[model samples]
Target chain A: PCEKHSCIAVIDAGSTGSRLHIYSYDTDDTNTPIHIEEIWNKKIKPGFASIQPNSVTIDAYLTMLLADAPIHNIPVYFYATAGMRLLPQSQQKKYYDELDYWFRQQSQWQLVEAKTITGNDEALFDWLAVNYKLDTLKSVQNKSVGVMDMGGASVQIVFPMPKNAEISKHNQVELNIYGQNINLYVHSFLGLGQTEMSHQFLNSPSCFANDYPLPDGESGQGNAPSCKEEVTSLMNSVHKVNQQIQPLLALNPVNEWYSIGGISNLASSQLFHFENSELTNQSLLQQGDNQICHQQWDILNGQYPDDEYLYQYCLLSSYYYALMVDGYGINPNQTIHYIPPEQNLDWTIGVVLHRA
Target chain B: PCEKHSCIAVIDAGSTGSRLHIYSYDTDDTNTPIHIEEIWNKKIKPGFASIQPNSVTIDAYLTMLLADAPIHNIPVYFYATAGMRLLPQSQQKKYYDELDYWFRQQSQWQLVEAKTITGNDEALFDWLAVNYKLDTLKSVQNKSVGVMDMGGASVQIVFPMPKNAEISKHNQVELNIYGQNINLYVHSFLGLGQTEMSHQFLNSPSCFANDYPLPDGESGQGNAPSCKEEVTSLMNSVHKVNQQIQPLLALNPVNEWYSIGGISNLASSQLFHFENSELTNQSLLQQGDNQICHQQWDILNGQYPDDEYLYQYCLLSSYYYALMVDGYGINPNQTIHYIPPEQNLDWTIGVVLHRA
Candidate 1:
């Protein structure tokens, strides 16, 4: 699929942020496409999840993004992830209706995705993205990999399984891509993401090991062991749909997996790490709350006081550890991997590589 | 000598206000033009005089006027009267430069007069307009009349005369119009208009015959008779350039001139009036200072408690009346005629008459 000149643009309206990526590419005589340049890449916070549906806020972002783009007849896709997918159906409909009105009103530009994506679709796309980047999607060996994306409102787990893995019909997705039929297992767990899960224990003093400010000028204290138990209980309730899965090749970062795993490994380079050798003892995981987890967390806190997410880091680290180790029955001491932060790891890149 | 369908749009940026007139006309096979309808007419206050030069103020007005007009390639003329004409040359140039930029930027509408007109040009144009509306221009009878226009910052007197009327070189203008070489006498007295003259005596206590608030918390008493005298002295200084003129035809409303002369008369219908038959005496025109004028005005105040010019109206009315009757030596109580207020009286109508 060689072309003289082509441009690929995508808008990701994620849970915590929104971003636009514009890439220009040119193809050589051998039918090989070369990335010329990334024309523009910009991100804005307080994603569409918080924006009033019919307000001019979206227009402000669109104007800035389209300021210099070749908008006329260009293919543009807007994919909203976890945040929008978890919104109340009415609110989501409101945003979609407004976007529909705007698209019809504008005479230029081609809209690829007119509506928000479902969690299953998001997971499938991420899986395809991971395999595409790993250079295994169309290889004669027919190898594939798994992807785990943890966002504010939901968590997506997707991968290709063995033909005899006995995957659930609800989790299997079949797609014809570039004349190849690819089969994948994908599922998204709503409310199991780091942000929403923390909200359940936000007012509880026993869910964390440190004192922090709560809403409305309130203060709270943490108890790590109790926090870990609460998170394990939530996780057990989250991924219960699949019990017969086998090992899959990991391709992307495990979101909460980054906090406790050290960055010395290239695969987990994107996630921040906390040093707590004493906390590594699985024996303490079944102990009383305060003295055990506090002694370990206090050491890590002293090392980095001004961490941006310092307040929630302790709670998140404990929750993720419990979810993987006790709930999913994954070993906590094994090597954990994640795509690096500098790579802008998202499904759009995979989509572009396929289309362009 | 007319074409098919034509629209004439004129913007009069006056001293105290701005107005737009949109007139449509159609011509017959004989090429005789017939007035059809005035599509839209509107006005706004604090004319472009106070607007910052090179700012978007004029563009704001243009946008509003062009909002509903069939602007594509339509001949549009913006004529600024007394207010802009009285502005500093540099400021006038700034406005013109900005307007020139705007005209070039717009792909719609043809701007005929892109710059401000001089006072003499304004007077001549107004003269043509009055005669056009009167159906006298290009008449085989070759009969003509005069026009006296009193505005906020300047007053203009234009009249037709014999080729050998012995007019001053500066006041005489010859124009070849509609295949006729017409000779005329025209003069505009700058700084002698109603508003600008009152500004000259704006802070004076003895200049007015009413107790009114001054800029610095001082009270002033109304002294109409002496105010008339002071204005006469000012007008005497204004009309020195032309002393050989005789009876002239009055066009546009004499601003405050109507208040003194009742609305039952044709010329004074446009100007609002306040009545007090007993105080019409011209005896106290040569009164003394504040004490003497204040005493006479005090009596008049008791007789007529509600005088509009009791504040500055008296000053303005006196100045306009003196500029015409005493300075220009015109009849004070004779029948004067003006285009009815319902009709937008300006040179664009005359300019259209010639151009069409």
Candidate 2:
């Protein structure tokens, strides 16, 4: 039986597609009041990739959403990551300007732009991704893991480390304060996209222009390191990149770091994941099974779910697991502070949960 | 008799006067260097007050200078202090602008205007003062004395205590790699000059302009808490000022806080002496006949016929003593550093060196 009292609804709205995830219980604790339960997930072709979700897609997604929404309506949470953020200002304005022409764009459903991130946020994110899995330290001492999510065009870093450590009041107030001598770690992408990376041969380029070499990853043409023989050799590039940044990463010691994004999805999400692992692996999935995310393990073998039904799930099951954990407090170790939709290429919700 | 083997000269250009001092010595392993006879100390008017000295005074002073200036025609060794620095920049510039002005200028005859104090020079001065007083502790590892050098417009809070401690690199880099937050003891005063302090009230009159009846300090009639009042009171009200700044002074562990300045001359020099009963009671001079400086004592008593004779001699004596102990390596202690001329009035070579 579905534990209706403990379920959480996940709504992901993005540029590419939309997904709804219903998560069930995984862990239970008496000290914490919230409970989590996994239910069902559905995806619909909303023209999310070509055009921003119009009224038709939104309504269709919502209608399909009602089918699996817990009987109690539970806590319906919504998050939008990059799609809405990526829309050109003019195009977004056009979408909003003609709201009366297209659909009921109520203020509640209206989108808001996010604030620009400071350098500090970048460093903090790198720290989070490095120390995201350690739970004993965080739970016992209210410590934190660093969770860094690098998207196609945007990045976010979160720190859950205990606040007891001495923090410069100036940095705390500035929000842009990077770790000491951390001026080098924090960075952002202005217009670099996966299509751009491949088209420009940026990832593993044959030549790099002295004026504008790719920020990280293997060099290509100009300053690009040689990798004409095998794509697998591309994995070695990040090692060089990591070496250049190891000093910064080693700063402000934390418990764990977790990376989640299209770029991060490329490898095992470890410090040195091989090149293009995520996309290559995801392509092997059958058409009906492939959403956008490469990590299908999150759903292909849903814990406590019928094996046959798991393959039908479109969005990653890990997201629903996250919702269950956050809504029902089933997973005290993780927190779903925000849900990013645009960050996911598949009609999926991008969630960053961390523990140290 | 002059130790004919070696030729050397010592010139003390101070606030009170300029003195040509020649010290001839034969080194002996078991005993201190033997002191020989002085050459000449021709009294001259205070030339420091005027950047361009009178040619007549210069010519006469030059006669006495030539006599003691290295018997072998060797270069003269000399050091100048406060009087040289305080000369108007425009006035000093005029003199340095031409050769005519150069000869009139006695000590810093090297064409360079030694007006402001340099950090290295200040470090040397402070180092000497600390060694002379033996105001130091060994590896005992504890703060003892707080050294403050207050000038006409600025005040520096220094620690004679050798600071050696370390925090994590994270903190160090965060704070610009400087140890101890107190390292910022170096600060500046924009307009807190003697004129400003002596004339300004404790608080601005406009503060009480709104109150109908006006506060006790209003109307600028009575001495109340205002910038001007505070300055006046502080300058004249050392007792009150002492109590107010004592806590701030004692914030760091301190056994003694030596105040060095022209004001310190009020008690340190013979001009005005203090008693145990008086709050300002502190004296470095004894029941003597006005010869408070060791350099001046030898000349005033006519013990060293070769000692230079200017007007008041203590200022030059003090300047030489300070430099010798610190800059010249006559005294060695790592914890000492210099104070600016504006900070120590007794350091005013020409003014304090003037003999009646």
Candidate 3:
């Protein structure tokens, strides 16, 4: 028999990987009611987009994961991000059908309908999660913090509308949380994601330092200045709609946005390096030349010589800077704070609270 | 009307200063009824040994101290150390009579009979306080720790007797604590304190480097080796009984022993510099010479040339090492550990707990 404590489990299936987060709570006689206790947290790579799965692989993974857990029989929600949404309808159905059959095979798991969620769905859920986790959800006042999630496949900007702020009707999202009507401006731009832009520049010789193998079996070399110009142009187009939002808050440095389908492991690794490095918060262009961007491209490409074109970390950072600062008019000196690893930074906790 | 909380107050009047400590506790619904909260702590200098005080100065100091306290009615225990013990009987009696008059005038304070505690009495009280502060007093098992207090005019060593350890009957003391009968070995050595020895060596030319003014108005010079020999002889006579106690614990680096009565402000200032500097924990003598001591004396004296003989820090630390290691047969490599300033390392807190 499966026993369950009052807890929630969320499976965030993003473009690069899938992550499982199980959170439980402990209550005492103190004024503080319940504090979150992370029960199980694990990540699997090559998400639904790149991997083919059957009952054996899925069953083995789940069985191994459940063997170490003390709790069971909780609502398990599986939400797929941009990778699955971008898949062909027929291809997406094949994966879903297999997953549904797999779920039927395991009676121990309380599985909900696994579905591919929209980009806007991700943005709004992320906004809800950030506010809930930061303890701003219960406030009756109009005060709310903005959330910026820069992922590999897409970027999301979500925030409560400022007083008398004029925003387009298409970008505004309305929801009732705890009987409180909240209006948020949610916008997610596809193709502006780090991975999408990186892949798009695979054939661009100007993005790599040396001759490198391309997706079409051609080799190419790079010019740092040329790549910077191209990245700036691409970011300008992607963030054009997001220009209306005021005071952009990038969910970075912190692992909070990472667990909520906003940032991928691959993107975070590069983001972490870039932010911690001495070159952080510096301008992309200096006298019509992005020397720092070129220097980074050279260093990263030097490490992986054969896959130079595929490595767009330098360009990704440059594009991120351009999109946020130049394209959307954000302050260059704005600080990016990170949440300590001990806390529950996942959006699933917020989602569970919202459902309650 | 004045209210009294379940708290204790201890006033330590030492050779160089007078200090007051008031401790209160908060009881919760749990079985652990009390948690210590330091309500008041203050210190005033110019010891009774150095200056004759008027009633106006004494009354004003005590009045100013008790004015800011939340708890008004408590047993006030004033214990004067070696400073007043060295004073003439008439002088001590005169001061005590005046203090008694001052106490009778206060309606809010429950004053205990103030007295100049003997060196041995001070040592026993310090031993009680240190153990109580360390939380090793109420153990059901035989676990215990040694306490060492180095004062300006005397040094005290107190610890439990080890199995099969033969110590003289005159040196050991027995006490029954919490229904557990415990036997302790305690001893205090007079004239071994930093200030007393430093003063005694004022006429010894071999302790100073250059021609310097002595207290007797004579010019003096020193040889490093000669001073080291003199310090060794002085420590040997002072700590003759302490030779039986092995593995000496120097209550230093930590503010605990210093705040109690051991290690005067002057010794602490030199000790602070020595501990923080790169020259910490080094031997006093190496290669049959005290080069390090000379180097320190030179460096400090070079900064203040006219005050060369007054800077007896090198000799103090040297004497401390000699008394503990050479006189008491302690292991030379034993490190001196210090509790940081933020913690309740003071003996006054320990004294309050001891009374409880």
Candidate 4:
């Protein structure tokens, strides 16, 4: 027993990169935990799928990530989500084969299950992690919630849909996450992740501020409704999110909705006005159109010298409105939601709560 | 363009602070506004009488508040209640003079006279606000209503005591709104509000938690029976409370008792248990005894550091029971619903609806 502090480690191998979250905590009076704080966190570029498969390369990556960290003898969870899900079976084994070999020789970090978790399993994590931050998961609260994971390559959304076999094949999940029944309606839309979707839309003139040069030499129009129409094809037509889930969500809405991703970043900028990390679809569209989307791009880049994501917010806001309001039927004018980059939300927090 | 529904603003220049509430209303054939829903609300602190009484401080305070409202062109009613009544006409003139100057400088506001209204006059609207929320005033609810306002200076009770004899016409109110006749009886006992009543027992040992030092250098023994006993002595012997109104209230048509004031804050403590936004007088008394009156003083002080009114709970609990049960003859076993602090419930809502 380490008398200092009890800690655990969880690996969030997502679409962007692999992040190791080490958390320290002490149990409360009821044997429930009180503070599960991030003691040390480290991220490495290029996900497991991106790396060349071999013993030496994978071994180097592991040592560089773990050997520098202070704590040992903690239980470690290694799980990947959308990133590895996109990988074919032929591409998956080579990475895991090297990982298994590397772990066998190492000292006991208590390496638990090494596997690629389904989006369904991560729907549990997505819900649990955000709710855990809110103290909504500490005890059984007879309330429902929705959490969206707006990540690098996929936007994972989860809500309370009961266990009926009709939709249970992939999107519907049932579990007792944090001492409560969780029958979740989950779905991940590929190519709508803020970064992955940007590549396709960059050449389109409507996505940027007026007169901004597109890479293909077209001048930008920077019209929000036009940008939404362009992204609607990818969000509605390809994903079929609107016809399938919009009406159900409009009917059985959760108590509150929240997200974790670049949306939080955009809402956090100096140009944005908010209270307690909350944003509305109506406010976002109004400000997004008036401020950056339709403003002079040359003037904006001059003002925001250090802002790396200034170029992305115009298209980002329109894309978000299309995907959530249009496709998901979330009421644009009246509905309000929260995005928490402030919480440093990662699904790995849920991994600690898991029996693993 | 005045195309949309009309709106008005009211300032509750109360004892604790000034609150600006913006209400929007739709008018029908009668030319009288209907559906007077609160569109915006803001509050800021320190008693109106306690301010610096200069143009500089008063002007800054009013601007920072009114500027925060989205609409400025609306008609305004600035009425101060018990707080201003406590001040003499000479001292009240200073706030009124500056408020007049402040209004003249701003063209948007149609300012009504900024003056003090007695608790007796304010009581009419206090009843109106509660009944308005209950929708009792809009049409014949067919159910009688009672509003009990418990403040620091005095407690006021209003119920339907239709056109009775021997009661002063000032305390008995009659109204015809929409299409129904309404009548009410109201009374405010002087020197019986919690703060004024508390000063009489500052020297006593029984009123505070265990071993709490009295201002007169005696240590408290913390007994509820002994504490409520002394408070009851002040209630019945000093105030003659039971003689004046108890018999009338016992037979009155107050179908439900709704208390409004600091009672919300006192009952809203973490130690107290509540249901349906109500307090059983017995439960409040028992909880006050266990949690505040009989408990160790130092332990509680440390635990509830941010509790604004923690020290007062013991006597406040005993005092309320003394007033409601011993003084007013209300049944201790039954429940009294409260207007929680979150609603910003006050007499201001009553001010706007008054006939010009």
What value does DockQ give for candidate 3? Answer: 0.00
Off by over 4 Å in 3: A1-356, B1-5, B26-34, B49-58, B64-68, B138-144, B162-172, B176-179, B209-225, B238-292, B296-310, B339-344
Number of the candidate with higher lDDT, 1 or 4: 4
- Give the DockQ (2 decimals) of all models: 0.00, 0.00, 0.00, 0.00
**Mind giving the per-residue lDDT tens digits that candidate 1 earns over A184-300?**
666666556665555444433455444443321224466666677656654553234224222433322233222111111212212243233123324324332343235344554
Model 2 spans with C-alpha error above 4 angstroms: A1-4, A24-37, A46-49, A52-54, A61-72, A89-138, A141-144, A159-199, A202-251, A262-265, A268-356, B1-356
Instruction: Please report, as a residue range, the 10-residue window in candidate 3 chain B with the lowest summed lDDT.
Output: B251-260
Q: State the DockQ, from 0 to 1, for candidate 1.
A: 0.00
Number of the top TM-score candidate: 4
Candidate 4 lDDT over residue span A1-356, tens digit each: 24566788888877656788888877655454447788889998667766667998898888777778777677888888666755533456688888888888877577887777765567678787788887787676676788877776667788887676766356776666545666778776644567555644654567888777543234677878878876776566445669877866876677788888778888888877877778888888878788778988889878885676676677888988888888888878744556556657777777776543
lDDT (C-alpha) at residue B338 in model 3: 37
Question: What shift in Å separates residue B276 of candidate 1 from its native position after superposition?
Answer: 76
Error of 4 at A155 (Å): 0.5
Write down the TM-score of every candidate: 0.41, 0.27, 0.41, 0.48
Residue A292, model 1: lDDT of: 27
| Candidate 1, CAPRI quality class derived from DockQ | incorrect
Fnat of every candidate, listed in order: 0.00, 0.00, 0.00, 0.00
Candidate 1 segments exceeding 4 Å error = A1-4, A25-37, A55-57, A70-72, A141-144, A162-170, A176-180, A212-225, A238-303, A353-356, B1-356
Candidate order by TM-score, decreasing, is 4, 1, 3, 2
